[PDB]
Ligand binder design. Structure first.
Ligand code: HEM
Ligand SMILES: CC(=O)NCCSc1nonc1/C(=N/O)N[C@H]1Cc2ccc(F)cc21
Length: 375
């Protein structure tokens, strides 16, 4: 079993299990704004209401779940304040009374002061009925931006792919213990289970089409998840007033900030973060947007002996085929992901070189996965 320090749940994996919905009464002013972003943004009163906040201390966020909720709350409020109605008028300064506590909490959790995948997917959910299982119909998100923004479909399908992958993650200690104890049969079984689970994760991905509309994502939801690293709208980044004097750059939310695909890249010896290209650079930089416990886990998998080199050294077709099934499952996820990028970015953008450059980046990562096949 995985060590408690890494914050990996048996059921939900890298997701925060049963995350908090309500903060203490102390932070009701934060909560009212974040719960009513659709109306507040539409009516153009969000920014005024953010500006008229008092600075609330982060000391009354006592445990990890409450601190994670606060990040999600302040994260969503921050994106609403920056992007406004999502029509091009941007705020270049985040006000003192929200920026300071958001930055203090962010330093405490070792995350950047911007909404990340870990906020808006991994901590942004609940069960409708606690006695029923983790399915779309029994689940809801905690926070959305605009009416018709498809954020429930968008965040929960990502979460459900994330949860599907958790079943493979709990096998990882079996993989390594089987290698050191020279348990061939155990290792093969473990690889066939990981492949099975990553194949299941692809079928969960199919649900995106049912619950997320292309126009709604591209025209609205993508605007609010946008960051301010290399963004012409905020050339120099965002001024976090009273915490830093100069404006800081931070990347927007992405499932590239997921620890799932990186975890199995590392496990399988798919050297994605090697080579020194844009792919490698991006994927390593994205680890800074993961929770510290999760990047520590990825660091620990890299420190372990190579599964790839173990399977190559044995002259064992069954193990090679079980290993290739895991790699091929990752290739399939990435192949399917490209089709989603086509539907959800490329076509809406055309209806409105970067598009070619984007697809070639993703194809490079997939090509590096494909190259790790043994036969
Ligand atoms: C509306 C649907 C989606 C769109 C339009 C989309 C788009 C993109 C884009 C443009 C990138 C390149 C990185 C960047 O520009 O920051 C990317 C990377 C990535 N995406 Fe998505 N994505 C979607 C859904 C998902 C989902 C649900 C997952 C799985 C949870 C996922 C997994 C990944 C991963 C792991 C990367 C990093 C590159 C890699 O490892 O292949 N994406 N995505
Ligand atoms: C918002 C923006 O422009 N980000 C930089 C470009 S990457 C991107 N865009 O939009 N979606 C992206 C995605 N990249 O893996 N997966 C989707 C799935 C998901 C969950 C949370 C999130 F916050 C994003 C996503």
């Amino acid at each position: 079993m995985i060590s408690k320090e890494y914050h990996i749940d048996e059921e939900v994996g890298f997701a925060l299990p049963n995350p908090q919905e309500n903060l203490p009464d102390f932070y009701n002013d934060w909560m009212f704004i974040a719960k009513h972003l659709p109306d507040l943004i539409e009516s153009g009163q969000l920014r005024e209401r953010v500006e008229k906040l008092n600075m609330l201390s982060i000391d009354h966020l006592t445990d990890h779940k409450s601190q994670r909720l606060a990040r999600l709350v302040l994260g969503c409020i921050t994106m609403a304040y920056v992007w406004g109605k999502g029509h091009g008028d941007v705020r270049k300064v985040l006000p003192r009374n929200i920026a300071v506590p958001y930055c203090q909490l962010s330093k405490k959790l070792e995350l950047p002061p911007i909404l990340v995948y870990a906020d808006c997917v991994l901590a942004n959910w609940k069960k409708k009925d606690p006695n029923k299982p983790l399915t779309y119909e029994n689940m809801d998100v905690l926070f959305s931006f605009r009416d018709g923004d498809c954020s429930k479909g968008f965040f929960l399908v990502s979460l459900l792919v994330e949860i599907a992958a958790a079943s493979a993650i709990k096998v990882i200690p079996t993989v390594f213990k089987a290698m050191q104890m020279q348990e061939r049969d155990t290792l093969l079984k473990a690889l066939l289970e990981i492949a099975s689970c990553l194949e299941k994760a692809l079928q969960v991905f199919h649900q995106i089409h049912d619950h997320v509309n292309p126009k709604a994502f591209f025209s609205v939801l993508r605007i609010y998840l946008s960051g301010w690293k290399g963004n012409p709208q905020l050339s120099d980044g965002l001024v976090y007033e009273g915490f830093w004097e100069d404006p800081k750059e931070f990347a927007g939310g992405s499932a590239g900030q997921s620890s799932v695909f990186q975890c199995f890249d590392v496990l399988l010896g798919i050297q994605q973060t090697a080579g020194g290209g844009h792919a490698a650079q991006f994927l390593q930089d994205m680890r800074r947007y993961m929770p510290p416990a999760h990047r520590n886990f990825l660091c620990s998998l890299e420190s372990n002996p190579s599964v790839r080199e173990f399977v190559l050294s044995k002259g064992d077709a069954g193990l090679r085929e079980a290993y290739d099934a895991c790699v091929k499952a990752l290739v399939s996820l990435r192949s399917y992901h490209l089709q989603i990028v086509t539907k959800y970015i490329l076509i809406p953008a055309s209806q409105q070189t970067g598009g070619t450059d984007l697809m070639n980046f993703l194809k490079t990562v997939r090509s590096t996965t494909e190259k790790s096949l043994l036969k």
